[PDB]
Amino acid sequence: HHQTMPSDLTQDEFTQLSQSIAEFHTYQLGNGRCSSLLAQRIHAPPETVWSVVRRFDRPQIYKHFIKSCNVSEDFEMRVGCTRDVNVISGLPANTSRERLDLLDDDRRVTGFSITGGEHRLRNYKSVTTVHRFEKRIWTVVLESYVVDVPEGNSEEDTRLFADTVIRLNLQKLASITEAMNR
Ligand SMILES: O=S(=O)(NCc1ccccn1)c1ccc(Br)c2ccccc12
Ligand SMILES: [Br-]
């Protein structure tokens, strides 16, 4: 018997989601890369959670640390389209340019890449999936990513970093989506 964190999946969680992990949240590692997987349980229906997560043009809605995110005018939210996001002042990243890779309203799957900008997460690729859970009906959100490990940094350092941003983001996501409830 061991000890995991709360971002790591529980057993019941993993047995239901394993296939999803197999398909969407698994990356080719090795050679200065690193990846990670985070879960968040949310006492709200998947449909609500998905509608927020999918808003590629308005990540501010739940991601932290965004001063602004501009898309273009002839911007239609569809695969290949992009967003220029500006981070608040005082952080170790100023701007990010991200491309939408993946948008499936049927399977509630989405993902973007960073291509890139003023920061040190080179070639970051993320995927986020939402799932239904029953026993009283809740949601589980999985977010994973892979990204390059910068010159004089450890892979553990890089994972810690990305993990934190994602972890807080999902907490915000949880928070607003549970917010109205019923
Ligand atoms: O532009 S982002 O909103 N990208 C979304 C994002 C970026 C990285 C991890 C998870 N999610 C963003 C926010 C905060 C930090 Br620190 C970032 C640092 C580098 C690049 C982008 C950054
Ligand atoms: Br950075």
Beta-strand relationship, 125-134 and 137-148: antiparallel
Alpha-carbon distance 142 to 164, whole Å?
14
Task: Please state the separation of Cα 87 from the chain's center in Å.
Answer: 16
Per the entry, the structure determination technique was X-ray
Nearby residues for ligand 2 (ion, Cβ within 5 Å): 92-93, 119-120
How long a stretch of residues is the chain? 182
Q: For atom 17 of ligand 1, which residue has the closest CA?
A: 93
Pick among 3.30.360.10, 3.40.50.170, 3.30.530.20, 3.40.50.300: CATH of 1-182? 3.30.530.20
Task: Give the angle subtended at the CA of 128 by the CAs of 161 and 82, to the nearest 5°.
Answer: 85
When computed from its CA atoms, the radius of gyration of the chain, rounded to whole angstroms, is: 16
**Ligand 1 center–CA 165 separation, angstroms:** 7
- The conformational region for residue 27 under phi > 0 = left, psi -120 to 50 = alpha, else beta, is beta
Q: Is residue 120 marked as binding?
A: yes
Distances (CA, A) of 179 to 39, 56, 108, 174: 19, 21, 21, 8
Q: Is residue 4 marked as binding?
A: no
